[PDB]
Symmetry: C2
Subunit: 307 residues, 2 copies
């Protein structure tokens, strides 16, 4: 009686049509072409020596428009101006992208998810979902050449770009900026020592995923008990889970509504899973508790929202 | 010193440009518009009652071209012919799709992976990777209205279509056809009792995933032993793993080349993981041995 539930990326076509390559000197990375501007990481202008201690304002003014080779597929775009907004370069080009989607630049919050279109040399290679971790990193898959790849959501009729890729930390997690060029987290676009802080599990998302399991007929873990927010948080603190807040209880409301299971009842089921384990069983195919689905991700998938 | 490894779908844009909606009476599903043909499940011509016991030849003789409403966006495409090939309907339309990519129709093998573009009313909802299981089902996410959604691989700019969605079995797994209309597995396009058969674990894929862990710097499980092919298969059989053959050993060759770790050495590490378990440790973020990545999936990601 169960039904499937998968980590599902947004369809990527609207974003694929915006990916270009930007080459400055010997460095090539990806850019995002919206109307008559290409957005890309400003470190395209740096040599390996520059990256050790970059003076970005000085390095940018030393570049000419001709120093930027921008290619959309096999068509060379001509740069007519270059400016900087925080860590993002804006290259004004003399032609407008005819496939520009309705778009917004948004800054997401920790715990929220987005789709990544991983690209190399301006060409898309794959698509997958990520969550902004509480420590402001993402668990992605990015090789050399992926800088400038973007993360996005599709919100009704609009592509909301929220992430542009910049770096891989020594623990194999990833960091980047919003499309205004401001890093998520305390990271900087230079080759200086930086490390991911300690991470925690996104409790509200684990609860949303447990609701997804119930909605999809995989409900072996439900118990007959209920708890309070404070009592649940006493347990959350012992297992490196984020404290559950009232705002989180509120955003779980729609899933509580559809199942008839109150949030604090599901908290009691989660408490038993943390304290006693998974009993040699899976939930939606997983042997661990999944924390990279938001409540809205569950609603979107269970309702078949299209774009 | 590790690096990331993710289940990664192909970019969906080339396929999105081919998705249309097909409506016959009150039944609406998805179709695939390539050149001047729309491919869709033949059960678009069935009512709910027809589905209990359809005779498709007789149901199709009763249809006109007009009975098929095809919409690409909200642009109606005029149907100028209709023909059946196994469980697929082919609707000739008066316009060739200007967005037709270079494409092939391929019949994939159990253990091979592909990306699914889940669609409703001819519009895309999301994209994810699936493996064809040894029992010829896939573990997807498909709601009512998803039928005709397709699975595909992209090799450079050539789209190989390999799956068209038809059904959800009572255990929440999914079945469908290739693009020539032949079901994978023993399933039939009728609302009659059918169930997924016993499955097994895709051994060659588990090994590829362990190579992926090594390549990406998550290698705690690697031992310094080796085994023979037959000794490995004797152990893995007890864990419901498919037999590993020399053909599978050869396909793991690129990963053995890049790591310098022989396939039979990896088999010895997998043997130990089957005997002892993980003991609270994870590999690439997982507490289970993952079997839905092929050797080429690993090479495609790490290159």
């Amino acid at each position: 009686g169960s039904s499937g539930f998968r980590k599902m990326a947004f369809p990527s076509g609207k974003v694929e049509g915006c990916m270009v390559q930007v080459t400055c000197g010997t460095t090539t990375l990806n850019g995002l072409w919206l109307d008559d501007v290409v957005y890309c990481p400003r470190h395209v202008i740096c040599t390996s020596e520059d990256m050790l201690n970059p003076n970005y304002e000085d390095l940018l003014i030393r570049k000419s428009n001709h120093n930027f080779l921008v290619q959309a597929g096999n068509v060379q775009l001509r740069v007519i101006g270059h400016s900087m907004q925080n860590c993002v370069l804006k290259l004004k080009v003399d032609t407008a992208n005819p496939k520009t989607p309705k778009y917004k630049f948004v800054r997401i919050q920790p715990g929220q998810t987005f789709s990544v279109l991983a690209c190399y040399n301006g060409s898309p290679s794959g698509v997958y979902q990520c969550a902004m971790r509480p420590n402001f990193t993402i668990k992605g898959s990015f090789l050399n050449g992926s800088c400038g790849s973007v993360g996005f959501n599709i919100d009704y009729d609009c592509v909301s770009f929220c992430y542009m890729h910049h770096m891989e930390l020594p623990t194999g997690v990833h960091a980047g900026t919003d499309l205004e060029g401001n890093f998520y987290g305390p990271f900087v676009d230079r080759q200086t020592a930086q490390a991911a802080g300690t991470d925690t599990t996104i409790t509200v998302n684990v609860l949303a995923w447990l609701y997804a399991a119930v909605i999809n007929g995989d409900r072996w873990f439900l118990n007959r008990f209920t708890t309070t927010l404070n009592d649940f948080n006493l347990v959350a603190m012992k297992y490196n889970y984020e404290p559950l807040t009232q705002d989180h209880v509120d955003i779980l409301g729609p899933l509580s509504a559809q199942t008839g299971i109150a949030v604090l009842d599901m908290c009691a089921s989660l408490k038993e899973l943390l304290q006693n384990g998974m009993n040699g069983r899976t939930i939606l195919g997983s042997a661990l508790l999944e924390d990279e689905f938001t409540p809205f991700d569950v609603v979107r998938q269970c309702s078949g929202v299209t774009f």
